[PDB]
């Protein structure tokens, strides 16, 4: 039970093999086939970087649920944006309507130790030296 | 403020002497070099040096003053010592009692008889060390007994103290 170990990653993806495979692998992983129960999450929620993360044990239990992000990618959920595919930074619209990130966030403040005061009006601007809502 | 602040316990027999102050301890009677122009007030037995002036020679002398003498009391507070440890799949050691052991030349009358304040400690099949009146030549003969086959920029086999994180780069690979 208390065998959990460090292992952060993304998801919403149907194919664990290219990514999730050498993590706990010989390191202590067992079973595979998480994709069927990725559907317990990846059918909808988790596109905001929402990792399981599973735990250690004799077997591989399953793939069920996923823990919510800290993320520079959570509070800005309502697009996944569109900029950055061709050379991060630079042109390619630094801006589309001011509330768009706050209006979609606000409820951004899930998992963290205890409690930050606000996901929206009083913290969003800082993840843009972590990105570019700046 | 920090250039001469030494408490000096043990009931130490340190007192300024023509180049060579007195010592007592586990068996202590040691003398230390000085250049007299310094001198140190040693009332009761304090270490609290008087600098002859303050040009760079003397002020670098200020440390040779302090430091040498600094451990000099600490060293006789015990049988002063450094931790030490060879390890490696192929070798051996044995305190004997009155012979140095070791096995890494591998046809090996290794022993040189220990000098003076030196005394060996056989802790663990691999962790031997040394102790005594000295620090410096304890830092030497140990290094000397270290001096025989030191490194192995690959597999561990290295004779060590506690040892720095031994630097490690691949042989033919890994």
């Amino acid at each position: 039970v208390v065998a959990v170990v460090k292992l952060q990653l993304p998801a919403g993806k149907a194919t664990p093999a290219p990514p999730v495979g050498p993590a706990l692998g010989q390191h202590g992983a067992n079973i595979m086939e998480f994709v069927k129960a990725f559907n317990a999450a990846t059918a909808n929620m988790g596109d905001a970087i929402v990792p399981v993360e599973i735990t250690i044990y004799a077997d591989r239990s399953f793939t069920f649920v996923t823990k919510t992000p800290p993320a520079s990618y959570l509070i800005r959920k309502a697009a996944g944006l569109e900029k950055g595919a061709h050379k991060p930074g630079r042109e390619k619209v630094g801006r589309i309507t001011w509330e768009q990130v706050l209006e979609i966030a606000k409820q951004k403040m899930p998992d963290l130790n205890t409690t930050d005061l606000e996901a929206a009006a009083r913290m969003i601007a800082g993840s843009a030296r972590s990105m570019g809502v700046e | 403020i920090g250039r001469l602040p030494i408490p000096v316990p043990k009931g130490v027999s340190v007192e300024v002497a023509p180049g060579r102050v007195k010592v007592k301890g586990p068996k202590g009677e040691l003398e230390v070099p000085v250049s007299p122009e310094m001198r140190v007030v040693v009332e009761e037995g304090v270490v609290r040096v008087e600098r002859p002036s303050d040009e760079r020679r003397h002020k670098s002398l200020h440390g040779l003053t302090r430091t040498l003498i600094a451990n000099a009391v600490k060293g006789v507070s015990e049988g002063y010592s450094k931790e030490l440890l060879i390890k490696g799949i192929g070798y051996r050691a044995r305190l004997v009692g009155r012979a140095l052991e070791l096995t890494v030349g591998f046809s090996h009358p290794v022993v040189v008889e220990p000098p003076e304040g030196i005394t060996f400690e056989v802790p663990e099949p691999t962790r031997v060390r040394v102790s005594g009146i000295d620090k410096q030549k304890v830092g030497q003969v140990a290094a000397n007994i270290r001096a025989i086959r030191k490194p192995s920029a690959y597999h561990e086999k290295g004779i060590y103290y506690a040892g720095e994180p031994v630097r490690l780069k691949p042989g033919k690979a890994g």
Binding site: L112, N113, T114, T115, D116, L117 | -
Partner: protein, 130 residues
């Protein structure tokens, strides 16, 4: 050069916006996890400056900075200068304390505090958490 001026004025104010003092010396656990204390204040109230760990001499005798009538606590370790007045000290203080015991090697050690103005006894502080 860097004297009684900015960077050392508004820091007095949370202690001075009212006067319900609080303090802590903890920082013995990683900041990556210590934030559990840093985030505790919202559960303990709302984004309170609990466990700020303000600088010694720049806050070890902060009364010297701005006449706080002597915050005679413990100069040992860092001084949080926790602004309980900034939050809502009452039974809420227990949330900032109980979390500091179970977590870390004492994730939040008990320290001097002063509701409104006059200091409470340090021994009575744990009883005052409720």
């Amino acid at each position: 050069k860097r004297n009684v001026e900015l960077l050392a004025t508004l820091k007095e104010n949370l202690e001075r916006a009212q006067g319900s003092f609080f303090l802590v010396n903890y920082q013995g656990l990683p900041a990556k996890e210590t934030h559990a204390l840093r985030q505790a204040l919202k559960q303990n109230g709302a984004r309170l400056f609990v466990a700020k760990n303000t600088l010694i001499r720049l806050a070890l005798k902060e009364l010297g900075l701005p006449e706080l009538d002597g915050l005679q606590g413990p100069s040992a370790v860092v001084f949080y200068e926790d602004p309980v007045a900034a939050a809502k000290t009452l039974v809420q203080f227990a949330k900032s304390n109980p979390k500091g015991i179970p977590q870390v090697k004492s994730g939040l050690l008990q320290g001097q505090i002063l509701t409104a103005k006059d200091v409470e006894a340090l021994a009575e502080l744990p009883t005052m958490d409720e």
